[PDB]
């Protein structure tokens, strides 16, 4: 299988602030009403984060494009989504993403998830496209178009539909599915968090914590990754997914990580409620020097 799309209308990306998001529990240790200092990979506050809003805009030839370039992985990636109709499905993490090295794949199917490390032969423009059309009976259909061949599938794991599904009550457009991916010592750790919002698109200034979800013992090398978009096939033309189609206005944000020292405040139950970045500014340096969120007058010593 392989499909080409023309869709070469280009445009530069856009930048925003991370403000104060991107804090996750570093260990399985529980504490109560204490302040803890730690050193680990994090997202520095008020950062330089990319925003990939590059697809067709609702109008006359409104800059149609496929929004999925490959990006470097480095040490850690923070992935943020604001999307309601389930346009993004999964991801591919690898080094050469070819028929010469292994590559981990994550894909959701509106039910329990599919996870595997294997050796696939990805297409030029990876995607999976589905459509609901009554052909033999009304309202079914799953599809598959991601790759052409797959050899040496050395692991399999089907547990749950991820926290992407299973919304609660009231609320509704949560649209803050935040994920952090780490690869340490042959272990692929994934964190997740969901939080309701009240705005069409912006990162709110509130504070939230990210829980550990899974730690897969894979042990493969990742240097680049790519997202997977659930293409919608408007099956009114004989050119299938290689022809005219229409979808929404999905977009996402990607941020990177660097080693930092952070101060964390645990409440009386064991949930992080406020963090302080050590390397921000003189106030932050002083507040990291002595364990306190408030400081009195005088003159203090720093690095």
């Amino acid at each position, epitope marked *: 299988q392989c499909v080409n799309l023309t869709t070469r209308t280009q445009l530069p990306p856009a930048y925003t602030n991370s403000f104060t998001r991107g804090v996750y529990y570093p260990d399985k240790v529980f504490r109560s009403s204490v302040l803890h200092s730690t050193q680990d990979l994090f997202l520095p506050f008020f950062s330089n984060v990319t925003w990939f809003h590059a697809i067709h805009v609702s109008g006359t030839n409104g800059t149609k494009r496929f929004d999925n370039p490959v990006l470097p992985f480095n040490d850690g990636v923070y992935f943020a989504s604001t999307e309601k109709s*389930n346009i993004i499905r999964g991801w591919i993490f690898g080094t050469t993403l070819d028929s010469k090295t292994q590559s981990l794949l994550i894909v959701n199917n509106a039910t329990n998830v599919v996870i595997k490390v294997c050796e696939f032969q990805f297409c030029n423009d990876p995607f999976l496209g589905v459509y609901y059309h009554k052909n033999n009976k009304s309202w*079914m259909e799953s599809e598959f178009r991601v790759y052409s061949s797959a050899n040496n599938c050395t692991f399999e794991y089907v547990s749950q539909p991820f926290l992407m599904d299973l919304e609660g009550k009231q609320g509704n457009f949560k649209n803050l599915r935040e994920f952090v991916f780490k690869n340490i010592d042959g272990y692929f750790k994934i964190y997740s968090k969901h939080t309701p919002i009240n705005l069409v698109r912006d990162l709110p200034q509130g504070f939230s914590a990210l829980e550990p979800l899974v730690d897969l013992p894979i042990g493969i090398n990742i240097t680049r990754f790519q997202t997977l978009l659930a293409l*919608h096939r*408007s099956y009114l033309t004989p050119g299938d997914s290689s022809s005219g189609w229409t979808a929404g206005a999905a977009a996402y944000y990607v941020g990177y990580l660097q080693p930092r020292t952070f101060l964390l405040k645990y409440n009386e139950n064991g949930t992080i409620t406020d963090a302080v970045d050590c390397a921000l500014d003189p106030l932050s340096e002083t507040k990291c020097t002595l364990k306190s969120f408030t400081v009195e007058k005088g003159i203090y010593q720093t690095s």
Partner: antibody
Amino acid sequence: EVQLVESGGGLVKPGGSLRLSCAASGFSFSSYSMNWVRQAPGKGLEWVSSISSNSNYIYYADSMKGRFTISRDNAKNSLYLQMNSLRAEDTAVYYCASNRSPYDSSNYYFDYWGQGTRVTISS
Amino acid sequence: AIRMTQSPSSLSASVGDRVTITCQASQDISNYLNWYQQKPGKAPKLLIYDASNLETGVPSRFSGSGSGTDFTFTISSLQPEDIATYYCQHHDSLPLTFGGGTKVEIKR
């Protein structure tokens, strides 16, 4: 072939109770979710209630809160509504409609419609 | 609830004429609007979802555009089977609320 067999219309005295029912035949009724919408003569369409898929989340209209009971039965693939109304204007035509998401992608828009049942509240 | 303004309430134009229906909301809701078509004496039918997506089995002569709080419903060329009623409806967090509705006609 998707059939929505509906029944339960009629004329009653104010404060009466009725039993609306529509059975879906020809598809996975349990997998998808239904929805309700009513139309007064010469008026637009307004949502009434919802049952989702596993009946885990139930939504009722604010104007008709605590008045209608909605249920479904996958054993014989039907949808029931105990309609208890104390107001005359509820005289209208009802429609049970089907969605397009597998179970619940993101809230409920309409994909299929029935024929509509007539309900009259008058002396 | 968010207010829907539909313009025009009703317009009349001969066949083969571009028809524009403007639906405006009182709150920024991005692309979460749906267009429903109802023929006389018949149950309503869905035409456009996400305010810009054409479904399967819907004639290609119909289209839609717009985003934010303003949306346009476009008929490139009228044909003698498009006489019906059209409705625009948001889809965010409120259970449901339909607009006033627009009925189209032909000047001949």
